[PDB]
Structure formats: C-alpha cells, structure tokens
Amino acid sequence: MLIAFEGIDGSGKTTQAKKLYEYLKQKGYFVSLYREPGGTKVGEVLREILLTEELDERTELLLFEASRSKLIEEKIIPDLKRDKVVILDRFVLSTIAYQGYGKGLDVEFIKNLNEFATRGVKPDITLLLDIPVDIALRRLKEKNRFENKEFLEKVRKGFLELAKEEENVVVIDASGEEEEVFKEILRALSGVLR
Amino acid sequence: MLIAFEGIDGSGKTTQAKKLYEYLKQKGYFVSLYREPGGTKVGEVLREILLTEELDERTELLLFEASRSKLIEEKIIPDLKRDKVVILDRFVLSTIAYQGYGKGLDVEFIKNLNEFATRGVKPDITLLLDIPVDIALRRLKEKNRFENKEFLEKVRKGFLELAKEEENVVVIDASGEEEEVFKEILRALSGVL
Ligand SMILES: Nc1ncnc2c1ncn2[C@@H]1O[C@H](COP(=O)(O)OP(=O)(O)O)[C@@H](O)[C@H]1O
Ligand SMILES: Nc1ncnc2c1ncn2[C@@H]1O[C@H](COP(=O)(O)OP(=O)(O)O)[C@@H](O)[C@H]1O
Ligand SMILES: Cc1cn([C@H]2C[C@H](O)[C@@H](COP(=O)(O)O)O2)c(=O)[nH]c1=O
Ligand SMILES: Cc1cn([C@H]2C[C@H](O)[C@@H](COP(=O)(O)O)O2)c(=O)[nH]c1=O
DSSP: OEEEEEOSTTSSHHHHHHHHHHHHHHTTOOEEEEESSOSSHHHHHHHHHHHHSOOOHHHHHHHHHHHHHHHIIIIIHHHHHTTOEEEEESOHHHHIIIIIIITOOOHHHHHHHHHHHHTTOOOSEEEEEEOOHHHHHHHHHHTTOOOOHHHHHHHHHHHHHHHHHSSSEEEEETTSOHHHHHHHHHHHHTTTOO | OEEEEEOSTTSSHHHHHHHHHHHHHHTTOOEEEEESSOSSHHHHHHHHHHHHSOOOHHHHHHHHHHHHHHHIIIIIHHHHHTTOEEEEESOHHHHIIIIIIITOOOHHHHHHHHHHHHTTOOOSEEEEEEOOHHHHHHHHHTTTOOOOHHHHHHHHHHHHHHHHHSSSEEEEETTSOHHHHHHHHHHHHTTTO
C-alpha cells in the first residue's frame, strides 16, 4: 500500500515519514521510504540539479516529473507488487502546489504530467502536514534553512484546496509537538491499514 | 531565424549543421549552433544521463523535454530576439519520431510537452535528412557506433509521416556525398533566407 506525506517546507515530513517507517517496520510490515525528488540513483542526480542550479520553472517541472517517473518505474511499482508499504516524502500534490499554485503553471497540465509519470499510481492515503508558514520558517531558520514566505503562503493554500478537491487526503495539524503529530497520523491511518 | 536539422542517427545532421553554421557566418549572419539534448550546461548533464544510464521511456521523454526547455529559455529565445540565425542539431520532431513512432508513447502528449518546453517556438524551416537505415548504419559502423535497425526503421518512417503532417519540413535526400547534400540544403533554404 502507498502512503504519501505532503506539505510545505518545514512541516515535518522528513521527520514524520521516518517515524512512520520505523513504526510500521516494528509492527512487521515490509516498508520502503522514498523522498521526492530523489529516491533513485538517477532521481538523486536530478534532485542535486534542482537544489543547486538556477532553473526556469518549466525545466523545473520537467525534472520533478522525470525524477518521479524513475522512482515509480524503478521502485514504487515493484514494491507495491510485493505488498510493501511504500512511504513517500512528497508526491504529486507537491508538484501541483509548488509548480501550479506557487509558480503559476497550469494545474491541468501538471496533473497530466503527474498521471504520465505515475502510470496512474495513486496513494491509498495522503497525509497533508498543514502548518502556518511562519511556524515552518522558524523551524527551518533554526537549521539555517531560509525559504520564501510570500511563495510558501500561496503553496500552503494550494495544498489546502487540494485536500478538499482530491481523493483520500487527511489534513494533519503539523504545528503540534512531534509525538502528538505522530498520533494524529496514526489515527488518520487507522482506517486504511492495521 | 530558426533552422532545425532532423533525421535518424547517421543521416549527417552534425556534419551538415556545422557546414551550414560556417557558411552562414562567412555570409555575415550572427549564428548559433546547438545540439539536442544538450546545448546548455544543465542540458549537457541531462544528455550524459540519457546516453549512459538505463532509463525507461517515460523518464527519457521527460529528460529530453527538460533539456529542450533549458535550451529554449537560456539560449534560443534570447538568440532569436537578437536576430541570430539559430541552427539546431535535432529538435521537436526527433522527440515525436523517437519517443512516439519508435517507442510507442502518445504523440499528442508528446506534442503538448513539446509546446510547453518550446513556449510555442517553431522553426522557420526543418531540414529532414532522410536516408535508408542500412546506409546510416554503415556510416555509423565506420566510426564504431551501432544502433538498432528495427528501431530505426520505425523512426525513419515516423520522420517521413511528420514531413507530410507537420509544417515547413523539407525532405532532403541525405544518401549522397557531403557537397551534394549541402547543395540540396541551400536550395531548400533559399525558400526561407
Ligand atoms: N513537531 C515538531 N516541532 C518542532 N520542530 C520539529 C517538529 N517536527 C520536526 N521538527 C524540526 O523542524 C525541522 C523541519 O522538519 P523536517 O522533518 O525536515 O520538515 P520537512 O521535511 O517538512 O521540510 C527540522 O529541524 C526538525 O527536526
Ligand atoms: N554525405 C556523407 N556521406 C558519407 N558519410 C558521411 C556523410 N556525411 C557525414 N558522414 C559521416 O557519417 C557519420 C555520421 O554523420 P553525423 O553528421 O555525425 O550524423 P548524425 O549527426 O546525423 O548522427 C560521421 O562519421 C560523418 O563523418
Ligand atoms: C516533489 C517536489 C518538490 N518541490 C520542492 C519542494 C522543496 O522546496 C524541494 C524538495 O525539498 P525537500 O526535500 O526539502 O522536501 O523541492 C517542488 O517544487 N516540486 C515538486 O514536485
Ligand atoms: C533530441 C532527441 C534525441 N533523441 C535521441 C536520438 C539519438 O539517438 C540520441 C543522441 O542524439 P545524437 O547522437 O543525435 O546527439 O538521442 C531522442 O530519442 N529524443 C529526442 O527528443
């Protein structure tokens, strides 16, 4: 089964995805954990380009999708066939929120690309880690990571509209303390798997 | 203005595009020459991935477009704005013929990605270097390059259907000698330049 974490930078996805990976493993699931972009040899090369180079927004979209396509074909589809629980730190809603709502690229076009890269694989559940931008930015600032408030305000709202419009997205209050956040996530998952 | 060379591997695009670059530069044009994939620092990184890694055909398609998008935004659009003659070694028809006719990906979808990557930038003329697959292969074998005959037969045909279906495409008989081929290229261009 497929569990996707989504949300703005500094919402706790890395943290919570790893917490979930260890928890489910301990419970006897066979689990995989992948980040996007990245998660394959080729995707990681693309992730470094995306994080280090000055790119226009079109080229960026196409690289995010290329990384996803490699991950889907190389790892996610084979994992799912073997009944692994696949946990993703970011997936298709990040593309729509960042490239669409943030950068103003066309949302229907993005969805079509998403569908092409995924071969239509969709999550059983998406956990949206919702958090006020200013709180995310203080968390990131502690680790010397700076992100753009005006941009992230639009991205946050994108994610929240997607949570209303798209299937199987649960809005998590990610402003909580780590353990409380994790317990909300467990409650959200409780219907989809044991 | 924008001039694109298309065709199968070993049809002579590198050779003829550089010929044309030198010719036009001597005539006093300010000229650029770019290859696809590649042609920018980032595009060349992508080209090396495309040429060296084992990729599925969807990831390939997306990397070809990403290289094109970088080229268009970084180089082609500003070049055209300055009235350079921009010469491309491969462009959007290669994607359709290779990924579409060759690998069986959806051609409308390909075209939509092409339109996105290019911002609608189209060539003034495309020179399709048409050649029998056997001849191209022989040319390639002499430089220790080997390509797939079955695949390339489909791609060749794809390019020929597109020369019929698409606009501003001239079919060049690329089977001749270098100067004979350049001669037909100059004939086709005097329609446009
Ligand atoms: N619930 C929390 N409260 C406060 N800080 C947190 C919480 N969860 C994670 N952090 C810290 O906030 C920062 C961003 O968390 P991270 O998991 O990397 O977020 P993301 O992957 O969404 O950008 C990290 O320094 C992390 O240790
Ligand atoms: N008209 C020609 N006749 C015979 N060989 C040629 C001709 N044009 C080019 N070649 C040679 O064929 C090979 C492929 O040409 P190249 O320009 O690299 O093709 P492409 O870029 O279409 O793959 C090269 O070794 C080149 O020197
Ligand atoms: C997956 C994905 C991430 N991103 C951005 C969000 C982050 O700011 C960066 C990924 O970094 P992160 O690994 O720190 O979560 O990539 C997009 O803009 N679009 C996408 O499709
Ligand atoms: C531009 C382009 C090239 N290709 C292929 C054609 C060549 O076999 C390969 C390397 O190109 P080259 O030898 O002409 O430089 O890339 C595609 O499959 N799709 C495309 O969109």
